[PDB]
């Protein structure tokens, strides 16, 4: 009936002065736009059909044409930025916001879906959706005593659309929009559906990626213990954004970092630092690096949790990106740590894997490692044990690597390597 229609036939049906012919033609366009292989989105746009679909959204008297036109427009808005712009330029944003209050659940859900796609395009469309007043009717759909009474797919779509209103930077979402969304987001973060949990975590990871004032808004809502619980989930789609949010929070103040430690996050790091997914090990090591960039009592918590042997592990063997983050974690630890904490790092066997990484063809990691060597020597200087460290570096072949770096192309590497040779190996 409405399967495999040409664009010409769809246009003829939509241009008829017959509501049923228009409905049949709109359903045919929806089915064309829903096909797996190459839907003709540009052909539908070029035929001038977006203004027709947008007017059909306002036909309260014909709920099937509202649903078919909403679905057709959701498929166009899900495309490229130019395709999402064509939907916005057709006036679809206020028309979809009016459909959020529809008595038909499948229509309201379609409007939620469409607005998530529009807001998801970037900062300008996200902020334009917010200015048209989408937040109040979106939140009203979730204002129920128990989230469990809502249809599963409907709740997942609402969570995903809210996560897109939290997404993107330059600029970050408006402060008052974030404050308005946050209580519902905290509630979704305690829901038991894995997809709702993943998208709630992604939303929180977006809101905590920026200035420390942005982190504060989130941390003040008391979400850190729930994020640490999700950090220990078995589902990789949940662990990934929960680790990103935790990693983002520890880029903040010493106080914000302390909330992550107090909630018991460090107890999860033996498994995260050995996780079979390289992106988990990488982002877990980045998180560790920002904790070792903290206070001496915070470095001590890393020590007490037995995480220094786990840092020796990732520095010894891991994908190069994780090893570079491990090098940062060590340089941060040696910069802020006490002599006792730095001595403990050497006793855990940091020197040999730190030296082996001086062979890497990455100028940034070389600078980071040479800075760590200098900090370890400064601690050894305070104990008069520089000779014991010099022999250790010589024995694992570290001396040959530092000597070779005296003829390096980079200025900072050349200067730091010549400095170590003259001060401790002459």
């Amino acid at each position: 009936g409405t399967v495999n229609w040409s664009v010409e036939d769809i246009v003829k049906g939509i241009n008829s002065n017959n509501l049923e012919s228009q409905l049949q033609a709109t359903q045919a366009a929806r089915k064309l736009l829903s096909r797996e292989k190459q839907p003709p989105i540009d052909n539908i746009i070029r035929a001038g059909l977006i203004p027709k679909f947008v007017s059909f959204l306002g036909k309260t008297d014909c709920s099937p044409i509202q649903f078919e036109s909403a679905w057709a427009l959701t498929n166009i808005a899900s495309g490229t930025s130019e395709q999402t712009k064509a939907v916005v330029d057709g006036g679809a944003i206020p028309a979809f916001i009016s459909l959020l209050a529809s008595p038909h659940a499948h229509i309201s859900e379609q409007a939620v879906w469409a607005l998530g796609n529009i807001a998801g395009d970037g900062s300008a469309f996200r902020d334009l959706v917010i200015k048209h007043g989408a937040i109040d009717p979106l939140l009203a759909l979730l204002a129920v005593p128990d989230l469990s009474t809502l249809a599963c797919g409907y709740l997942r779509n609402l969570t995903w659309t809210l996560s897109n209103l939290c997404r993107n930077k330059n600029p970050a979402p408006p402060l008052d929009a974030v404050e308005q969304i946050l209580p519902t987001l905290v509630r979704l973060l305690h829901h038991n559906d894995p997809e709702v949990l993943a998208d709630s975590c992604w939303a929180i990871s977006y809101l905590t990626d920026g200035p420390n004032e942005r982190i504060e808004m989130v941390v003040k809502k008391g979400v850190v213990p729930q994020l640490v619980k999700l950090l220990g989930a078995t589902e990789l789609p949940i662990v990934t954004p929960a680790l990103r949010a935790i990693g983002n929070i520890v880029t903040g103040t010493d106080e914000q970092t302390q909330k992550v430690i107090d909630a018991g996050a460090l107890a999860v790091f033996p498994s995260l630092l050995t996780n079979p997914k390289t992106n988990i090990q990488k982002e877990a090591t980045w998180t560790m690096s920002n904790i070792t960039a903290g206070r001496q009592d915070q470095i001590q918590q890393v020590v007490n949790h037995g995480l220094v042997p786990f840092l020796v592990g990732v520095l010894s063997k891991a994908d190069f990106k994780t090893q570079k983050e491990a090098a940062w974690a060590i340089t941060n630890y040696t910069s802020g740590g006490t002599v006792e904490q730095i001595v403990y790092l050497v006793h855990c066997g940091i020197i040999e894997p730190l030296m082996n990484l001086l062979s890497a063809k990455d100028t940034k990691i070389i600078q980071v490692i040479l800075d760590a060597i200098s900090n370890i020597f400064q601690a050894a200087e305070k104990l008069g044990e520089t000779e014991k460290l010099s022999i250790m570096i010589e024995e694992c072949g570290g001396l040959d690597k530092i000597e070779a770096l005296q003829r390096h192309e980079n200025e900072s590497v050349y200067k730091a390597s010549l400095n170590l040779i003259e001060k401790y190996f002459s």
Binding site: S34, E36, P39, W71, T74, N75, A77, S78, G79, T84, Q110, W113, G116, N117, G120, D121, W160, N164
Partner: peptide, 6 residues
Amino acid sequence: RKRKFS
């Protein structure tokens, strides 16, 4: 992210 309704 964007998502099509298939």
